[PDB]
Design a protein around this nucleic acid. Structure first.
Ligand SMILES: [Zn+2]
Ligand SMILES: [Zn+2]
Ligand SMILES: [Zn+2]
Ligand SMILES: [Zn+2]
Lengths: 196, 833, 103, 83, 120
RNA sequence: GAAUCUCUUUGAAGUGUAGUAUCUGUUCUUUUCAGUGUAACAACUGAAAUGACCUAGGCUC
């Protein structure tokens, strides 16, 4: 029932834990440091975790942290689409514009069950501080994602470009964020996503 | 789980087959079913719930549903007792009940006293003695009055015993006028009868305590004995027997009243009436005054001799009792007995038909043995030689018993060479010719051989010839019988310096040690134990170092006696022969026992633990401790506890300087059960050393630092158990400063509940009272002595009760009492000269 | 007793007589049931001796004892030695459910 | 069961050893036990008895002993008052 | 020393005299709490055990690993308890009226007392 | 007993008495008053205001 995980003793002076909570004290029993509850067997531990008691103490601890100050069914063919970066310019500075093209009714003919099909591609700015390899980092990426196709990134060394100032007249349909509504276009009829 | 459904008694429950009065009404009967028909784990819980809530449920529904259950014929001794236990716990809980339900319960649990087994007799007494305090005198007296008038012999017999248990519980002084009511009642005949029997069971239950109360009862005997009713007259005579035997010679001054009519009853009514009368007078004989004993004994002995021919069983049983008691009389001479009583005794009462019935055979033997004291021993056994050679096997058995009990008391030193020869000859004959399976012959024969020993040598050889002759036989009964006889005869052979003969015995037994039958094999190993114990090891033939490796597989034979005698003998080689067996073989022994002590036997388990002392003396103590500590990690409680015992004994024989440091590391191990085994092993290793722990105390206190502080009530419990022995044996050494610490950690645990925790902590604090002295221990008790909390108070007054029990003068100077503290104070404490 | 709770004691002024225990119970201090360094022989009141009941084991109350019971050195210092007459009057739930369990 | 036995042993120990505070005991009941045991030891030891005899200055020592005995009962104060 | 709950003392004038008598040591205050005297959060972070350094000299620490055969000299062990460790005594112990409350941990006070010693 | 040939291999579970701890599930105030209870709580036991007015409150009716 332990699923082969090693829970170190409390006195062993902390490898990442699944839940950094259940420990074993100086004795052999298992304890929840937050809940301060003793548990005889790992089954009792799982009852504790699945119990509302522990959860309440987790929310209380999160409140203490603030005081101190669809995802499953996601289809994934991991297919790299074709981007068309191009140095743009208007007035009064310089901005970037990307032209991402998508399938020509080649494989999207088998999936049409209004499952987020109406949802257009989405962009987000990610810091390289977190990667599957975690080697080098220190720059941002303008990630672009669509359900079936594979994610795409574009490095942005410049601290700020095209970061405008009240372009439109403050209309509030947040969509996803100010970035997406502010500067993206989704030609859904031709399947072309423009971003600038 | 409701294990083992009862269809008829469950459909008798009805209730829920699928509203507070309906909820208690249902759950109550549901629990009752859990107890009667259910699962052990279930019924154990329903007991605790039923007792905790026993005050909540109305006794009307409790007894209303519960009581009629026991009226059925489909109950079993298991289940009926399962309900009986609830009866006891509930009656002792509520403590107050109305008279109709008192009557119901007394009628239900009343027949229990009559059941054949003292197991049921005991609890049947418990329900009644617990109910007596509940209902009281007046209620129970109002209960027995309508019942004693019943025409049913069975029920009258029942509430005779029940009324007796009540009389003992609430005292016979309060219930005595009732005894005078049914006693002296002129109305009913059965009321007279049972009114007399109640005196019987009162006398039996009180025993010697009947003395101070014997005045009122003898009134009933003297006045009610004169009744013209033969059964009444008989029962009175039995009451004189019981109250005389339980009386002991004191009561003569009171019995002198009823002394007279017994004789005029004897010389007249005769018959079974004279049987009961001579039982009474016979019981009077020991309490008679020496002159009066002289007269009345000589008066009775004539009637006895005349009545030797009584065809009836009861009268013969009585006669044997009267001779049994009259034997102790100094007036009648052993010359008189040998000239008249004894010859007319042995010829009449030793007839073969006598030996057929055991309950008579008892009184025959005990009577004969009481005769042996006054009679010459050589004369008694002289008359006892002919019954030994009779061809009837049970008659030979009784013939043995007489020799056993006689020779144990007197001994055979009175016998001449010739009849001494014929004695051992007869014993060998009956021993080798015995048909029946019984354990007496080798026991009593062994008793004779222990009585006379140096004289045995020329018989000692043929006796052993018969021994080997039976050691080869096709019946395991005769096998283990002869082996048991061997183990008994081994010490005697040493007196004849036959030692080579002991060697050939050791040979043959060692060669037969490979027998399949465990029951015989165990006895064989017992004979091995006696041989090796008696004779020097060097001259032992096999020799020992060849013996033991054949013993190492024996430990796995399971059963019981095999490991009993096996562990005994392995221990014998453990203390006697350290050098012979190789140390690795001793390690195999350690592993085998370490696996072996899972057995359920406390003798096997205890002796098994004891052998580790000898093995620790012979071999490496650390070597033993490795296996022991490695076995502490096992979940089984017997393994943990008795491995802790082994650690204790090893620490006793080796000394704690070796064992303790490794123990402390085994405590450093995080595992709970291991830490518990450590703390208990520390307790035992301390109780086995009185003067040693004094030097070791300081190294203990940092370990008890984490023990007493530990969250687990178990660790706090067993640590307190350490402080018990450690404090008792280290008290007065001067370590009080350490004891002060150890206590300072204990005081907060006083409020801890549970029975085990509370008694371990109480005993610990009492041990601290001896090491610290009351004064400081007092100071804590005082500053907590009263307090508002109603809880703190109840807790500390326990410790102060035990302190007041052990110490009083010791606490006298330490009472924090001043003239402003209390009004009167004591004017004499301030006096200074 | 120290372990089994429901066992009831006597606690009267002990007489000259010495209590007997069976070979099965041999070695136990009748209070604490300890096997170590026994000191003084138990003494029971006359009310616990009289007839056949005198032969019983003062500990297990059933078997007929040969051996004398001794108090340990821990009870002799705790004074429980002199407390009163040790005996077990009630057989106890353990022994009861044992006998009814087997038969 | 266990606590229930502790009640019976409470009755027995209270019977033998007289005053043992159980749970609720009045200060009059308990202080009486204090006085009784203190006087008990003062007269019990020939030592402390000899001591109180001289420090008090009585003509004889048994006067002090039987004084303590009498002083054990409460009414002895009023008894002295009536002399 | 007297506290608000002493008002309901059935014999308050007496209980004040006893509780305020010279050498009496007031009841440990973990009563009136229902936590069974140890719920302590600090109990979670207590060290399993530490050998007294004199016993740690015996080297059985290395011989047997308690953390997640072993034969040693009788003279060595005996001398550790007696020759080396006769005058040895635990460093902390406690005093006349020291009582251990739940939240207390002696170890930090041991390093404290030792530190008031070393550091000047 | 000795001699030869072929082939193969190696190099067990379990019980009962008492008692404890720990999960988890589940429960929860409309307001008062008085009693029990409590160290005080808690808890338990009984009843029930309806109407009007003023800026939590009322010597209110
Ligand atoms: Zn938790
Ligand atoms: Zn007794
Ligand atoms: Zn016994
Ligand atoms: Zn003892």
């Amino acid at each position: 029932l332990s699923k082969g995980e090693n829970v170190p003793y409390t006195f062993q002076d902390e490898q990442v834990r699944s839940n950094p909570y259940i420990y074993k004290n100086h004795s052999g029993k298992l304890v929840c440091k937050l809940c301060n509850t003793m548990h005889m067997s790992w089954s009792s531990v799982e009852r504790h975790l699945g119990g509302k008691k522990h959860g309440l103490n987790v929310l209380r601890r999160g409140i203490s942290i603030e005081k101190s100050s669809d995802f499953r069914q996601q289809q994934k063919i991991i297919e790299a689409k074709q981007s068309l970066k191009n140095n743009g310019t208007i007035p009064g500075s310089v901005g970037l514009a990307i032209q991402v093209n998508y399938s020509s009714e080649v494989k999207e003919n088998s999936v049409d069950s209004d499952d987020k099909a109406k949802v257009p591609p989405l962009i987000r700015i990610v810091s390289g501080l977190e990667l599957s390899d975690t080697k080098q980092k220190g720059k941002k990426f303008l990630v672009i994602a669509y359900e079936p196709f594979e994610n795409i990134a574009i490095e942005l060394p410049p601290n700020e470009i095209l970061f405008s100032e009240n372009n439109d007249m403050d209309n509030n349909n947040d969509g996803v964020d100010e970035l997406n509504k502010k500067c993206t276009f989704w030609d859904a009829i031709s399947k072309l996503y423009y971003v600038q | 789980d409701l294990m083992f459904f009862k269809p008829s008694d469950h459909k008798y429950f009805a209730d829920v087959i699928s509203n507070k009065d309906e909820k208690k009404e249902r759950t109550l009967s549901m629990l009752l079913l859990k107890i009667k028909n259910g699962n052990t784990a279930s019924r154990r819980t329903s007991m605790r719930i039923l007792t905790d809530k026993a005050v909540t449920f109305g006794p009307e529904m409790i007894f209303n549903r519960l009581l009629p259950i026991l009226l059925d014929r489909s109950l079993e001794d298991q289940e009926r007792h399962l309900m009986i236990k609830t009866i006891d716990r509930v009656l002792y809980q509520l403590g107050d009940l109305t008279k109709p339900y008192v009557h119901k319960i007394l009628v239900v649990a009343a027949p229990l006293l009559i059941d054949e087994d003292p197991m049921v007799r005991s609890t049947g007494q418990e329900i009644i003695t617990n109910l007596s305090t509940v209902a009281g005198l007046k209620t129970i007296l109002t209960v027995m009055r309508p019942d004693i008038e019943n025409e049913d012999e069975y029920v009258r017999n029942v509430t005779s015993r029940a009324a007796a248990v009540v009389a003992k519980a609430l005292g016979v002084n309060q219930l005595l006028p009732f005894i005078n009511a049914a006693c002296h009642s002129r109305k009913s005949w059965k009321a007279r009868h049972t009114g007399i029997k109640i005196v019987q069971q009162i006398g039996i239950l009180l025993g010697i305590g009947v003395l101070n109360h014997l005045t009122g009862l003898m009134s009933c005997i003297k006045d009610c004995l004169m009744d013209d009713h033969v059964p009444v007259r008989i029962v009175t005579a039995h009451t004189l027997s019981t109250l005389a035997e339980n009386s002991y010679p004191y009561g003569i001054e009171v019995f002198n009243v009823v002394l007279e009519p017994l004789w005029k009853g004897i010389r007249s009514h005769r018959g079974k009436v004279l049987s009961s009368f001579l039982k009474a007078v016979g019981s009077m004989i020991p309490l008679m005054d020496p002159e009066y004993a002289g007269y009345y004994t000589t008066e009775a002995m004539r009637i006895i001799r005349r009545e030797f021919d009584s065809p009836d069983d009861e009268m013969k049983k009585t006669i044997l009792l009267v001779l049994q008691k009259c034997s102790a009389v100094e007036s009648i001479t052993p010359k008189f007995l040998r000239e008249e009583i004894a010859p007319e005794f042995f010829q009449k009462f030793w007839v073969r038909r006598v030996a057929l019935d055991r309950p008579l055979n008892k009184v025959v033997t005990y009577t004969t043995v009481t005769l042996a004291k006054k009679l010459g021993c050589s004369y008694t056994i002289d008359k006892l030689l002919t019954p030994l050679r009779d061809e009837a096997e049970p008659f030979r058995t009784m013939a043995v018993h007489a020799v056993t009990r006689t020779v144990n008391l007197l001994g055979t030193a009175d016998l001449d060479e010739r009849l001494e020869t014929r004695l051992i000859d007869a014993l060998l004959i009956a021993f080798q010719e015995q048909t029946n399976s019984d354990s007496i012959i080798f026991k009593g024969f062994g008793a004779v051989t222990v009585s006379l020993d140096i004289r045995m040598k020329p018989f000692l050889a043929p006796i052993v010839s018969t021994i080997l002759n039976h050691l080869k036989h096709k019946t395991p009964l005769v096998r283990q019988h002869a082996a048991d006889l061997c183990a008994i005869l081994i010490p005697v052979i040493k007196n004849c310096h036959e030692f080579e003969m002991l060697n050939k015995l050791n040979i043959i037994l060692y060669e037969s040690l490979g027998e399949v039958y465990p029951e015989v094999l165990g006895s064989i190993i017992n004979a091995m134990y006696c041989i090796t114990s008696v004779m020097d090891l060097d001259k032992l033939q096999p020799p020992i170092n060849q013996i033991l490796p054949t013993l190492t597989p024996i430990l796995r034979n399971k059963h019981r006696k095999v490991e009993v005698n096996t562990i005994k003998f392995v221990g014998l080689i453990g203390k006697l022969a350290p050098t012979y067996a190789p140390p690795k073989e001793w390690m195999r022994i350690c592993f085998e026992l370490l696996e072996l002590l899972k057995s359920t036997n406390k003798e096997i388990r205890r002796s098994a633990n004891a052998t580790f002392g000898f093995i620790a003396e012979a071999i490496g103590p650390h070597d033993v401790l490795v296996a022991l500590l490695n076995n502490l990690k096992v979940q089984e409680r017997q393994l943990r506890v008795c491995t802790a015992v082994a650690i204790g004994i090893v620490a006793k024989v080796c000394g704690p300087y070796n064992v303790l440091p490794v123990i402390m590391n085994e405590y450093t191990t995080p595992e709970t059960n291991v830490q518990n085994g450590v703390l208990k092993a520390m307790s035992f290793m301390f109780e086995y050393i009185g003067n040693m722990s004094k030097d070791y105390i300081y190294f203990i206190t940092p370990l008890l630092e984490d023990a007493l502080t530990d969250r687990d009530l178990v660790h706090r419990q067993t640590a307190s158990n350490v402080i018990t022995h450690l404090a008792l044996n280290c008290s007065g050494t001067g370590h009080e400063d350490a004891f002060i610490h150890l206590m300072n950690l204990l005081i907060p645990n006083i409020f801890e509940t549970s029975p085990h925790a509370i008694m371990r902590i109480l005993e610990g604090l009492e041990a601290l009272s001896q090491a610290l002295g009351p004064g400081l221990f007092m100071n804590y008790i005082w500053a907590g002595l009263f307090h508002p909390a109603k809880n703190v108070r109840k807790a500390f007054w326990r410790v102060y009760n035990n302190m007041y029990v052990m110490y009083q003068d010791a606490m006298v100077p330490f009472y924090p009492v001043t003239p402003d503290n209390n009004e009167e104070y004591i004017e004499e404490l301030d006096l200074v000269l | 007793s120290r372990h089994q709770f429901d066992l009831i004691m006597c606690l009267k002024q002990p007489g000259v007589q010495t209590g007997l225990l069976c070979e099965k119970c041999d070695g136990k201090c009748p209070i604490c049931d300890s096997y170590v360094r026994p000191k003084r022989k138990v003494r029971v009141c006359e009310n616990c001796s009289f007839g056949k009941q005198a032969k019983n084991c003062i500990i297990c109350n059933l078997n007929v004892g040969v051996n004398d019971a001794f108090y340990c050195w821990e009870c002799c210092r705790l004074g429980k030695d002199k407390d009163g007459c040790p005996r077990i009057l009630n057989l106890g739930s353990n022994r009861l459910d044992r006998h009814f369990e087997k038969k | 069961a266990e606590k229930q036995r502790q009640l019976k042993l409470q009755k027995i120990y209270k019977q033998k050893y007289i005053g043992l505070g159980d749970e609720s005991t009045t200060r009059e009941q308990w202080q009486r036990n204090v006085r009784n045991d203190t006087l008990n030891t003062l007269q019990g030891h020939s030592a402390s008895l000899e001591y109180v005899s001289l420090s008090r200055g009585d003509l004889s020592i048994r006067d002090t002993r039987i004084h303590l005995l009498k002083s054990m009962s409460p009414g002895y104060k009023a008894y002295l008052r009536e002399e | 020393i007297i506290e608000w709950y002493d008002c309901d003392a059935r014999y308050p004038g007496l209980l004040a005299s006893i509780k305020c008598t010279k050498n009496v040591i007031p009841v440990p205050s973990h009563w009136q709490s229902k936590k069974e005297y140890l719920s302590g959060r600090s109990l979670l972070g207590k060290r399993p055990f530490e050998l007294p350094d004199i016993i740690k000299k015996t080297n059985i620490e290395q011989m047997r690993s308690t953390l997640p055969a072993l034969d040693l000299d009788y003279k060595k062990l005996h001398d550790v308890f007696f020759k080396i460790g006769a005058n040895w005594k635990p460093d902390h112990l406690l005093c006349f009226g020291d009582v251990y409350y739940e939240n207390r941990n002696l170890f930090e006070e041991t390093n404290w007392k030792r530190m008031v010693d070393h550091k000047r």
